[PDB]
Amino acid sequence: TFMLKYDENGTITDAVDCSQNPLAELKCSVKSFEIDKGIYQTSNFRVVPSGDVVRFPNITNLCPFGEVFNATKFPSVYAWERKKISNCVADYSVLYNSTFFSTFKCYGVSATKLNDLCFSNVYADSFVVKGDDVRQIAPGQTGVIADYNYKLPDDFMGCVLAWNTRNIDATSTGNYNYKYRYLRHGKLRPFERDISNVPFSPDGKPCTPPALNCYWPLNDYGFYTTTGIGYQPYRVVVLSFELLNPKLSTDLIKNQCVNFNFNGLTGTGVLTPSSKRFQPFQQFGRDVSDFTDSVRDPKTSEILDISPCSFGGVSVITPGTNASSEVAVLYQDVNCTDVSTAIHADQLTPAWRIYSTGNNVFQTQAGCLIGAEHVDTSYECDIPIGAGICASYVAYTMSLGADSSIAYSNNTIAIPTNFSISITTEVMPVSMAKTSVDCNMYICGDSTECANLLLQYGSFCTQLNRALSGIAAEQDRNTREVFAQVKQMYKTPTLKYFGGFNFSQILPDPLKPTKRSFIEDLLFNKVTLKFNGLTVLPPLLTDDMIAAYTAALVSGPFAMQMAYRFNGIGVTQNVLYENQKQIANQFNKAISQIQESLTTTSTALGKLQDVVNQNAQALNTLVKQLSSNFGAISSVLNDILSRLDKVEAEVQIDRLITGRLQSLQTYVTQQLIRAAEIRASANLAATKMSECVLGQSKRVDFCGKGYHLMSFPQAAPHGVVFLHVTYVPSQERNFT
Amino acid sequence: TFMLKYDENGTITDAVDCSQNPLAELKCSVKSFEIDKGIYQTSNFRVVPSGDVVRFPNITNLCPFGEVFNATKFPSVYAWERKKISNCVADYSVLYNSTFFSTFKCYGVSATKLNDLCFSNVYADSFVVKGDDVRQIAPGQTGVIADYNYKLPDDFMGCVLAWNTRNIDATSTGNYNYKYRYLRHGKLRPFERDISNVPFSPDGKPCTPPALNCYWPLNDYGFYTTTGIGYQPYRVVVLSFELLNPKLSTDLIKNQCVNFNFNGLTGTGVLTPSSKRFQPFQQFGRDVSDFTDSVRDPKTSEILDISPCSFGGVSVITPGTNASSEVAVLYQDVNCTDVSTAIHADQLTPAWRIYSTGNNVFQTQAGCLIGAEHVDTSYECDIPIGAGICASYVAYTMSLGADSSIAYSNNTIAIPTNFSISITTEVMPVSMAKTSVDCNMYICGDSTECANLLLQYGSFCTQLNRALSGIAAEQDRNTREVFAQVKQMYKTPTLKYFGGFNFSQILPDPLKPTKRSFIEDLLFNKVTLKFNGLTVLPPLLTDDMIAAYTAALVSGPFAMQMAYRFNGIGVTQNVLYENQKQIANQFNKAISQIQESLTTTSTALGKLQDVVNQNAQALNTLVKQLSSNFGAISSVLNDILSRLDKVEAEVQIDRLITGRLQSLQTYVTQQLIRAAEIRASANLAATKMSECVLGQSKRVDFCGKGYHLMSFPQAAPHGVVFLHVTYVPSQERNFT
């Protein structure tokens, strides 16, 4: 089926069934009309079957089973005789469709086919034994039949078939012909034939009875009509299957993946005649690793080569919200775009079948692009696809440097005198969702017998709480180290225009009912989105507690300080009585543009918005991984706890626990990596929130968009926003 | 049971059984009286069952099975007739408690209940076939009954019941009434009824017999008294179970989690009447995902809402060694502390049942705290619990900034002239336990047949040695890079008072029998704590080899050098002939306080003590994860290798291998992360042991407790200790 949109006024609202549109597949993949900018979703792709090729323009013979099964006499079990069959029709189900066989056993991979036409080189074993002796012919048996007379291999492939003939092999006085060895020096080799007769002695000395510790190895078989079936003689037939090293028409096509069928292989691969070797003559089939693609023909032994049609596909897009679904597809790795056109001739729908086709096929290095084709010069890269190709409009199809030049060397310089001051930002994630799971509440929640099937796989299970709790200790340990490094929590000032320009909207202010720092709340409004033991622990530090730490940092003589900071970047006393109106004018006309940078959807918080999505995609996967099982009875054991007995529940629950436990085990290890990752980003910012002590340049990053001369910190949900300034000289230059 | 303390003089010594005290649970969790400072152990918590609610103030009828089972005639198998039953009592075990049915089959989830009272809408199928035809009614059958006459679904839920009546349906001449279809164009749909009769032709042409390739599709049934049971007619009844879309008293409580029971759900959740929707009328039950909490009443269809009582609990503590067990508990997320008080009214012991209760319940944001309640102003944070609350005495219940103020802007400065010099430390881990496991020795140790059940799951198994060995290569690669960067291993000096102050106890000295650097051995005494293939490889570099590297580094004109280092921090020639007595007096009175910092239990090596515990908790988990199995025969296969045959051992060993392998597989991936983590801490220290070249400030960390002016390295087991100094101006200031 598909999925839909229940509005929770209880309403069957609008929804999309996909596969009427490959655009709709992307909505069918993740979620509804909410759309990327305009980014991907890697989906699946295949190639549709057509056509068959088979073997054997050679054989014209079946074999006479009836001269074996409907025969007269069978040989001994101690002296067993094998019969060879070549060039026969393996129509054994006709021999199965009878009541001729009481016992019908097949071992290993011979208990698999039971109806299926294959090919081998059959050998047949035959003997006659008594009643209960039938089960003694198997891998791992006892009794002098198995121990001293006849024994299968322990990895043997064959079918054993048997019946009873009281009518012939049983006489009233006893068919005393066949014998059994009950005194033999040792066990049997697999398929060992014993036609010799030597009288036995337990010390191994060859001697002759009647004597003490010198006796006979062979006695006869009582085959009576007037006895029960355990003493009655049973005629046994054992088959064998050695390989060749159901009609047909071979008819090579070339033309192909997408079916082929000899024995030993069902070829889903291209045909090419082709090359190379012929010799072995263990021929053919050898690959790295076991991907059999050297094939002989049955008639011409022609060196056929198999290669599949096994490729993927990802869709590029624009934002479908603010652009009108200018959707193109990138077939991933089927580089023969003609073969992609051979899937789009009509062409039997390979494989994302929908009602949208195109005629603007562009082949690239990364497979082939379908939807547009525009060799161009303009358009700096937006949506990269690989191989130096991007997507802008749609269109694209190139990449840019890009791009300037310069004068050469001379005997002159670059003086430049007039300058500018920027303000620029950066965001740094510092904390994940400080989360926790209860092990015993995800695993079955409430069943006692689930817990009874839980106390003995090794109670690590608290480890999945314990190793997860080590995150939660180290999570808020980061926020301490990035923040709690002040010497004394100084108070805010009462003069917002502290000498230089202002502290408007980055100023812990009086009223100002909220905190503190209006631009914090310009950041704090930038977010998106207890049954199953699944919680999120609250962090240690709260947001106003965070904003208290940020507030004293803004304090840091303030014009004399910033001038002294400028002298570190290479100016003097003269840039004090020069600039102080223009500096604030350079300041105040810049910081308001931050207040008009955001909110314009802010366009750059995707660092932070990824982080909450790094958990929201994770946990919502885990809840979806709950109710999909395998164990193949249901998906919620609350039924099957009440359904089965305690005989077969533990068959199914222990299957069900393994799917739940391993997925949970997958989550913790998936969780720990980003815990290790963001801590590395924390220690990046932990250093970087020291420049932010004034605190001049590193050199030369932080930000690296000019020199430094100071910077300002802010706050953010699960993150830290900086405010880097600099000097930046303009031109002129005007120099020799 | 519990666990104890065997003193290894062979003595049954003192031990603790837990659950007489929630304090004792923490000792019952990890280990004995050894106690944290005073930190947690996250344990489990539940809510105790009480009360039941059930369905149906409606039905008053069972159904007449006896007019179906004890009836006269059954319809055909090619023309099968279904009978509908509504409003009956599903008392099928009474029909099971009989000898009326020879065959008793149930399929899918219908072979589960077999005694259990549930509800459905039963349909009944009935026919009469011959002897061996009973097994042909199943998912995946052959024969013209299954292929051409009647077929179940392959996912069907129902019970099939049958018997024999030679007394009625068998006559001496033959009950030739019912027929069988043996010539039909194609297979069957599931539950397809075939009441038509058209004579057959293999080319599909409608024609009329007697003609070549034009015959009849239906022949009769020989039902003889004078024949065997394989030809005798068997009467068959097939049941069906379609849903509704054992007595009772409904009696809504509201009041609740902690049991509820309709059909299709066993509600372990709160009751609230409540809201919202009514429409569908696929009603009710729909959640994200399948957490069914929309319920109708059987009478009033009232929109009941289910929410569980599923919460955890962690205990706070003081050090029980040096404080007198001032123990409080934090119930994790049951934020309704009244509901926690409703578990502590008396109240049927939910769920960590012990003999210790309290009456000082404080609700917080992180659930509810029980044990103390103290709204306060003092006490900077010690033991954080989250939501800005900590624990000191016990008590607590607040958080601090904390906390100062400052003067405002002016036309003055801060001159400060007198200064100080600190010494401060930091520790950096550089190496784990360089460990190794043998794969084949953890997995069964010594069994040949375990190895026979090991050679074919894909012999990665050396990979668990190989990927683990890649740690051990990269482990001691770190210690080279952090240390082996000297140009020439210079020798130690003979004058310990090398100009400035001294090198007392950080001085590779003559006698000094050990090395080198007395304060190394003040650090080296700060540690705590071959059957199962489980080793720890020795490191490359030894401790005296490490101390040799540290020794030449202390060398580094020495007063003129440290003065020139001071001039980098912003002083001149004048702070040479000013201070040289006071500097050593500032030096020597500070370094002895390091020699009185440690040992005071040293209070700060918990970085390094964690690292050995990061392995000691890991490996001791792994050894405990050995002897707890699941596979549910034993925990050591040395028994079951000698117990079973090679028929059922591979049933159990392959279950047993999977638990052992996956836990081992868990360990390596758990091991690799801290290998990646400490290497990041190594590259931190690898840079940081270059300042330590003199080697002035970064700026401004290393340490960041002042400027830099130099620093000293030391050595530590699996770690590196630094000695950062600085300048620090006092006051006065005294400036305008």
PDB file of all heavy atoms in Angstrom, chain A residues 441 446 456 458 460 466 477 489 535 549 638 643 679, chain B residues 46 109 112 266 310 333 401 404 607 617 625 628 677, unseen atoms left out:
ATOM      1  N   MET A 441      12.295  -1.670  28.936  1.00  0.00           N
ATOM      2  CA  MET A 441      11.020  -1.141  28.497  1.00  0.00           C
ATOM      3  C   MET A 441      10.910  -1.047  26.991  1.00  0.00           C
ATOM      4  O   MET A 441       9.798  -1.078  26.463  1.00  0.00           O
ATOM      5  CB  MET A 441      10.790   0.230  29.118  1.00  0.00           C
ATOM      6  CG  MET A 441      10.581   0.164  30.608  1.00  0.00           C
ATOM      7  SD  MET A 441      10.417   1.782  31.372  1.00  0.00           S
ATOM      8  CE  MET A 441      10.196   1.296  33.072  1.00  0.00           C
ATOM      9  N   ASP A 446       6.612  -4.850  29.225  1.00  0.00           N
ATOM     10  CA  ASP A 446       5.901  -5.246  30.429  1.00  0.00           C
ATOM     11  C   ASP A 446       5.742  -6.746  30.627  1.00  0.00           C
ATOM     12  O   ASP A 446       5.202  -7.148  31.661  1.00  0.00           O
ATOM     13  CB  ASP A 446       4.507  -4.610  30.430  1.00  0.00           C
ATOM     14  CG  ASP A 446       4.554  -3.110  30.566  1.00  0.00           C
ATOM     15  OD1 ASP A 446       5.473  -2.601  31.236  1.00  0.00           O
ATOM     16  OD2 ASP A 446       3.678  -2.434  29.990  1.00  0.00           O
ATOM     17  N   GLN A 456      19.224 -13.995  30.902  1.00  0.00           N
ATOM     18  CA  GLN A 456      20.297 -14.955  30.709  1.00  0.00           C
ATOM     19  C   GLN A 456      20.992 -14.873  29.356  1.00  0.00           C
ATOM     20  O   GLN A 456      21.736 -15.791  29.022  1.00  0.00           O
ATOM     21  CB  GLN A 456      19.771 -16.378  30.951  1.00  0.00           C
ATOM     22  CG  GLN A 456      18.757 -16.908  29.952  1.00  0.00           C
ATOM     23  CD  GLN A 456      17.332 -16.515  30.290  1.00  0.00           C
ATOM     24  OE1 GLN A 456      17.091 -15.533  30.986  1.00  0.00           O
ATOM     25  NE2 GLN A 456      16.378 -17.318  29.841  1.00  0.00           N
ATOM     26  N   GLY A 458      23.292 -12.804  29.102  1.00  0.00           N
ATOM     27  CA  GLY A 458      24.359 -11.940  29.508  1.00  0.00           C
ATOM     28  C   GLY A 458      23.720 -10.616  29.802  1.00  0.00           C
ATOM     29  O   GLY A 458      23.373  -9.873  28.882  1.00  0.00           O
ATOM     30  N   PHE A 460      24.359  -7.635  29.963  1.00  0.00           N
ATOM     31  CA  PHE A 460      24.937  -6.337  29.668  1.00  0.00           C
ATOM     32  C   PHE A 460      23.884  -5.266  29.856  1.00  0.00           C
ATOM     33  O   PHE A 460      24.136  -4.294  30.561  1.00  0.00           O
ATOM     34  CB  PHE A 460      25.551  -6.286  28.262  1.00  0.00           C
ATOM     35  CG  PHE A 460      24.589  -6.557  27.132  1.00  0.00           C
ATOM     36  CD1 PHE A 460      23.883  -5.531  26.521  1.00  0.00           C
ATOM     37  CD2 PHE A 460      24.445  -7.838  26.642  1.00  0.00           C
ATOM     38  CE1 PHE A 460      23.016  -5.794  25.482  1.00  0.00           C
ATOM     39  CE2 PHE A 460      23.598  -8.099  25.588  1.00  0.00           C
ATOM     40  CZ  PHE A 460      22.876  -7.076  25.014  1.00  0.00           C
ATOM     41  N   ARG A 466      24.171   2.058  30.533  1.00  0.00           N
ATOM     42  CA  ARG A 466      25.374   2.612  31.143  1.00  0.00           C
ATOM     43  C   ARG A 466      26.240   3.327  30.126  1.00  0.00           C
ATOM     44  O   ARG A 466      26.677   4.455  30.371  1.00  0.00           O
ATOM     45  CB  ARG A 466      26.196   1.527  31.831  1.00  0.00           C
ATOM     46  CG  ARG A 466      27.349   2.087  32.635  1.00  0.00           C
ATOM     47  CD  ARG A 466      28.093   1.020  33.413  1.00  0.00           C
ATOM     48  NE  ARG A 466      28.877   0.118  32.575  1.00  0.00           N
ATOM     49  CZ  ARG A 466      30.106   0.387  32.147  1.00  0.00           C
ATOM     50  NH1 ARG A 466      30.690   1.532  32.468  1.00  0.00           N
ATOM     51  NH2 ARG A 466      30.750  -0.491  31.397  1.00  0.00           N
ATOM     52  N   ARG A 477      29.162  18.016  30.360  1.00  0.00           N
ATOM     53  CA  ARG A 477      30.540  18.361  30.666  1.00  0.00           C
ATOM     54  C   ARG A 477      31.120  19.299  29.616  1.00  0.00           C
ATOM     55  O   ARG A 477      31.989  20.119  29.927  1.00  0.00           O
ATOM     56  CB  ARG A 477      31.367  17.085  30.769  1.00  0.00           C
ATOM     57  CG  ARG A 477      32.809  17.285  31.163  1.00  0.00           C
ATOM     58  CD  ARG A 477      33.519  15.957  31.238  1.00  0.00           C
ATOM     59  NE  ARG A 477      34.936  16.105  31.542  1.00  0.00           N
ATOM     60  CZ  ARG A 477      35.875  16.288  30.620  1.00  0.00           C
ATOM     61  NH1 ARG A 477      35.546  16.360  29.337  1.00  0.00           N
ATOM     62  NH2 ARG A 477      37.143  16.407  30.980  1.00  0.00           N
ATOM     63  N   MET A 489      31.438  36.407  37.784  1.00  0.00           N
ATOM     64  CA  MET A 489      30.259  36.738  36.997  1.00  0.00           C
ATOM     65  C   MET A 489      29.894  38.203  37.179  1.00  0.00           C
ATOM     66  O   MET A 489      29.073  38.539  38.036  1.00  0.00           O
ATOM     67  CB  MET A 489      29.085  35.845  37.395  1.00  0.00           C
ATOM     68  N   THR A 535      13.036   8.293  26.590  1.00  0.00           N
ATOM     69  CA  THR A 535      13.009   9.626  27.161  1.00  0.00           C
ATOM     70  C   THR A 535      14.130  10.478  26.601  1.00  0.00           C
ATOM     71  O   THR A 535      15.036  10.004  25.916  1.00  0.00           O
ATOM     72  CB  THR A 535      13.130   9.591  28.685  1.00  0.00           C
ATOM     73  OG1 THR A 535      12.967  10.918  29.194  1.00  0.00           O
ATOM     74  CG2 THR A 535      14.489   9.080  29.099  1.00  0.00           C
ATOM     75  N   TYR A 549      25.872  33.504  31.557  1.00  0.00           N
ATOM     76  CA  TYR A 549      27.290  33.362  31.254  1.00  0.00           C
ATOM     77  C   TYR A 549      27.706  34.263  30.110  1.00  0.00           C
ATOM     78  O   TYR A 549      28.796  34.839  30.133  1.00  0.00           O
ATOM     79  CB  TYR A 549      27.615  31.917  30.914  1.00  0.00           C
ATOM     80  CG  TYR A 549      27.693  31.026  32.111  1.00  0.00           C
ATOM     81  CD1 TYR A 549      27.544  29.658  31.985  1.00  0.00           C
ATOM     82  CD2 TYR A 549      27.901  31.555  33.373  1.00  0.00           C
ATOM     83  CE1 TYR A 549      27.609  28.835  33.083  1.00  0.00           C
ATOM     84  CE2 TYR A 549      27.972  30.744  34.476  1.00  0.00           C
ATOM     85  CZ  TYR A 549      27.824  29.384  34.328  1.00  0.00           C
ATOM     86  OH  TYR A 549      27.889  28.573  35.436  1.00  0.00           O
ATOM     87  N   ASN A 638       2.576  -8.498  22.609  1.00  0.00           N
ATOM     88  CA  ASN A 638       1.423  -8.479  23.503  1.00  0.00           C
ATOM     89  C   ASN A 638       0.326  -9.406  23.009  1.00  0.00           C
ATOM     90  O   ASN A 638      -0.388 -10.015  23.813  1.00  0.00           O
ATOM     91  CB  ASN A 638       0.886  -7.055  23.616  1.00  0.00           C
ATOM     92  CG  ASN A 638      -0.047  -6.872  24.786  1.00  0.00           C
ATOM     93  OD1 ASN A 638      -0.248  -7.778  25.589  1.00  0.00           O
ATOM     94  ND2 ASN A 638      -0.642  -5.689  24.880  1.00  0.00           N
ATOM     95  N   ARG A 643      -0.984 -15.529  22.925  1.00  0.00           N
ATOM     96  CA  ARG A 643      -1.414 -16.510  21.938  1.00  0.00           C
ATOM     97  C   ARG A 643      -0.837 -17.891  22.212  1.00  0.00           C
ATOM     98  O   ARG A 643      -1.577 -18.815  22.550  1.00  0.00           O
ATOM     99  CB  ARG A 643      -1.033 -16.073  20.525  1.00  0.00           C
ATOM    100  CG  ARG A 643      -1.725 -14.844  20.050  1.00  0.00           C
ATOM    101  CD  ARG A 643      -1.583 -14.721  18.562  1.00  0.00           C
ATOM    102  NE  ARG A 643      -2.375 -15.773  17.929  1.00  0.00           N
ATOM    103  CZ  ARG A 643      -3.639 -15.619  17.553  1.00  0.00           C
ATOM    104  NH1 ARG A 643      -4.248 -14.453  17.740  1.00  0.00           N
ATOM    105  NH2 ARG A 643      -4.287 -16.625  16.987  1.00  0.00           N
ATOM    106  N   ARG A 679      31.850  16.514  20.476  1.00  0.00           N
ATOM    107  CA  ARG A 679      32.866  16.837  21.467  1.00  0.00           C
ATOM    108  C   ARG A 679      34.140  17.345  20.809  1.00  0.00           C
ATOM    109  O   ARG A 679      34.828  18.205  21.371  1.00  0.00           O
ATOM    110  CB  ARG A 679      33.127  15.598  22.321  1.00  0.00           C
ATOM    111  CG  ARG A 679      33.973  15.755  23.579  1.00  0.00           C
ATOM    112  CD  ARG A 679      35.447  15.480  23.291  1.00  0.00           C
ATOM    113  NE  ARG A 679      35.586  14.389  22.336  1.00  0.00           N
ATOM    114  CZ  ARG A 679      35.501  13.099  22.640  1.00  0.00           C
ATOM    115  NH1 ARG A 679      35.262  12.730  23.888  1.00  0.00           N
ATOM    116  NH2 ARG A 679      35.624  12.180  21.691  1.00  0.00           N
TER     117      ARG A 679
ATOM    118  N   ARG B  46       9.392   0.499  38.145  1.00  0.00           N
ATOM    119  CA  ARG B  46       8.143   0.125  37.478  1.00  0.00           C
ATOM    120  C   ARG B  46       6.960   0.624  38.296  1.00  0.00           C
ATOM    121  O   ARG B  46       7.116   1.398  39.241  1.00  0.00           O
ATOM    122  CB  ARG B  46       8.019  -1.391  37.278  1.00  0.00           C
ATOM    123  CG  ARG B  46       8.996  -2.002  36.300  1.00  0.00           C
ATOM    124  CD  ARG B  46       8.723  -1.491  34.907  1.00  0.00           C
ATOM    125  NE  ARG B  46       7.390  -1.863  34.461  1.00  0.00           N
ATOM    126  CZ  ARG B  46       7.114  -3.009  33.849  1.00  0.00           C
ATOM    127  NH1 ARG B  46       8.084  -3.879  33.606  1.00  0.00           N
ATOM    128  NH2 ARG B  46       5.874  -3.282  33.474  1.00  0.00           N
ATOM    129  N   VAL B 109      -1.348 -18.058  12.921  1.00  0.00           N
ATOM    130  CA  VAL B 109      -1.823 -17.809  14.271  1.00  0.00           C
ATOM    131  C   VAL B 109      -3.295 -18.209  14.328  1.00  0.00           C
ATOM    132  O   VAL B 109      -4.216 -17.382  14.369  1.00  0.00           O
ATOM    133  CB  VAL B 109      -1.541 -16.362  14.733  1.00  0.00           C
ATOM    134  CG1 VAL B 109      -0.054 -16.214  15.036  1.00  0.00           C
ATOM    135  CG2 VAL B 109      -1.893 -15.330  13.678  1.00  0.00           C
ATOM    136  N   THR B 112      -2.130 -21.328  17.967  1.00  0.00           N
ATOM    137  CA  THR B 112      -1.588 -20.654  19.129  1.00  0.00           C
ATOM    138  C   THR B 112      -2.477 -20.829  20.350  1.00  0.00           C
ATOM    139  O   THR B 112      -2.002 -21.299  21.388  1.00  0.00           O
ATOM    140  CB  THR B 112      -1.416 -19.169  18.813  1.00  0.00           C
ATOM    141  OG1 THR B 112      -2.699 -18.577  18.633  1.00  0.00           O
ATOM    142  CG2 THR B 112      -0.626 -18.994  17.545  1.00  0.00           C
ATOM    143  N   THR B 266      -4.371  -5.675  26.045  1.00  0.00           N
ATOM    144  CA  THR B 266      -4.277  -5.857  27.485  1.00  0.00           C
ATOM    145  C   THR B 266      -3.702  -4.554  28.024  1.00  0.00           C
ATOM    146  O   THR B 266      -2.485  -4.403  28.137  1.00  0.00           O
ATOM    147  CB  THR B 266      -3.410  -7.039  27.837  1.00  0.00           C
ATOM    148  OG1 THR B 266      -2.069  -6.772  27.423  1.00  0.00           O
ATOM    149  CG2 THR B 266      -3.902  -8.283  27.119  1.00  0.00           C
ATOM    150  N   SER B 310       5.283   4.171  32.971  1.00  0.00           N
ATOM    151  CA  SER B 310       6.532   3.514  32.600  1.00  0.00           C
ATOM    152  C   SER B 310       7.713   4.455  32.811  1.00  0.00           C
ATOM    153  O   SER B 310       8.052   5.240  31.923  1.00  0.00           O
ATOM    154  CB  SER B 310       6.434   3.081  31.140  1.00  0.00           C
ATOM    155  OG  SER B 310       7.652   2.587  30.638  1.00  0.00           O
ATOM    156  N   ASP B 333      11.294  10.250  35.859  1.00  0.00           N
ATOM    157  CA  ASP B 333      10.416  10.991  34.969  1.00  0.00           C
ATOM    158  C   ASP B 333       8.945  10.912  35.337  1.00  0.00           C
ATOM    159  O   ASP B 333       8.111  11.435  34.592  1.00  0.00           O
ATOM    160  CB  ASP B 333      10.609  10.511  33.535  1.00  0.00           C
ATOM    161  CG  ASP B 333      11.920  10.964  32.957  1.00  0.00           C
ATOM    162  OD1 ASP B 333      12.391  12.047  33.357  1.00  0.00           O
ATOM    163  OD2 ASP B 333      12.484  10.245  32.108  1.00  0.00           O
ATOM    164  N   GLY B 401      25.536  31.158  39.974  1.00  0.00           N
ATOM    165  CA  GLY B 401      26.178  31.719  38.798  1.00  0.00           C
ATOM    166  C   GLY B 401      27.616  31.296  38.560  1.00  0.00           C
ATOM    167  O   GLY B 401      27.843  30.533  37.620  1.00  0.00           O
ATOM    168  N   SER B 404      29.607  38.135  40.902  1.00  0.00           N
ATOM    169  CA  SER B 404      30.341  39.344  41.271  1.00  0.00           C
ATOM    170  C   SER B 404      29.686  40.542  40.588  1.00  0.00           C
ATOM    171  O   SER B 404      28.563  40.455  40.095  1.00  0.00           O
ATOM    172  CB  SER B 404      31.828  39.228  40.899  1.00  0.00           C
ATOM    173  OG  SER B 404      32.492  38.242  41.667  1.00  0.00           O
ATOM    174  N   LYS B 607      40.625  12.057  35.471  1.00  0.00           N
ATOM    175  CA  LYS B 607      40.834  11.853  34.046  1.00  0.00           C
ATOM    176  C   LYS B 607      41.538  10.532  33.800  1.00  0.00           C
ATOM    177  O   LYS B 607      41.066   9.699  33.021  1.00  0.00           O
ATOM    178  CB  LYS B 607      41.648  12.999  33.464  1.00  0.00           C
ATOM    179  CG  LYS B 607      40.939  14.322  33.467  1.00  0.00           C
ATOM    180  CD  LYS B 607      41.795  15.359  32.785  1.00  0.00           C
ATOM    181  CE  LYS B 607      41.173  16.726  32.852  1.00  0.00           C
ATOM    182  NZ  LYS B 607      39.956  16.783  32.010  1.00  0.00           N
ATOM    183  N   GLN B 617      35.989  -1.799  33.253  1.00  0.00           N
ATOM    184  CA  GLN B 617      34.564  -2.058  33.141  1.00  0.00           C
ATOM    185  C   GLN B 617      34.246  -2.818  31.871  1.00  0.00           C
ATOM    186  O   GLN B 617      33.282  -3.587  31.836  1.00  0.00           O
ATOM    187  CB  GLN B 617      33.783  -0.754  33.184  1.00  0.00           C
ATOM    188  CG  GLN B 617      33.824  -0.090  34.533  1.00  0.00           C
ATOM    189  CD  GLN B 617      33.169   1.268  34.519  1.00  0.00           C
ATOM    190  OE1 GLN B 617      32.777   1.764  33.467  1.00  0.00           O
ATOM    191  NE2 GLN B 617      33.043   1.879  35.690  1.00  0.00           N
ATOM    192  N   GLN B 625      29.875 -11.536  30.357  1.00  0.00           N
ATOM    193  CA  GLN B 625      29.070 -11.892  29.199  1.00  0.00           C
ATOM    194  C   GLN B 625      29.400 -13.263  28.646  1.00  0.00           C
ATOM    195  O   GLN B 625      28.626 -13.776  27.835  1.00  0.00           O
ATOM    196  CB  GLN B 625      29.235 -10.868  28.087  1.00  0.00           C
ATOM    197  CG  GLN B 625      28.553  -9.556  28.352  1.00  0.00           C
ATOM    198  CD  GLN B 625      27.068  -9.720  28.549  1.00  0.00           C
ATOM    199  OE1 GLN B 625      26.538  -9.444  29.624  1.00  0.00           O
ATOM    200  NE2 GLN B 625      26.389 -10.207  27.520  1.00  0.00           N
ATOM    201  N   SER B 628      26.868 -16.541  30.676  1.00  0.00           N
ATOM    202  CA  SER B 628      25.437 -16.292  30.849  1.00  0.00           C
ATOM    203  C   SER B 628      24.751 -16.550  29.508  1.00  0.00           C
ATOM    204  O   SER B 628      24.832 -15.712  28.609  1.00  0.00           O
ATOM    205  CB  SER B 628      25.178 -14.880  31.334  1.00  0.00           C
ATOM    206  OG  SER B 628      23.788 -14.635  31.409  1.00  0.00           O
ATOM    207  N   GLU B 677      39.179   8.177  20.214  1.00  0.00           N
ATOM    208  CA  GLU B 677      38.995   9.341  21.064  1.00  0.00           C
ATOM    209  C   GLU B 677      40.300   9.784  21.697  1.00  0.00           C
ATOM    210  O   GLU B 677      40.641  10.970  21.674  1.00  0.00           O
ATOM    211  CB  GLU B 677      37.969   9.040  22.138  1.00  0.00           C
ATOM    212  CG  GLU B 677      37.805  10.167  23.100  1.00  0.00           C
ATOM    213  CD  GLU B 677      36.654   9.953  24.035  1.00  0.00           C
ATOM    214  OE1 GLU B 677      35.954   8.927  23.894  1.00  0.00           O
ATOM    215  OE2 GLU B 677      36.436  10.825  24.903  1.00  0.00           O
TER     216      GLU B 677
END
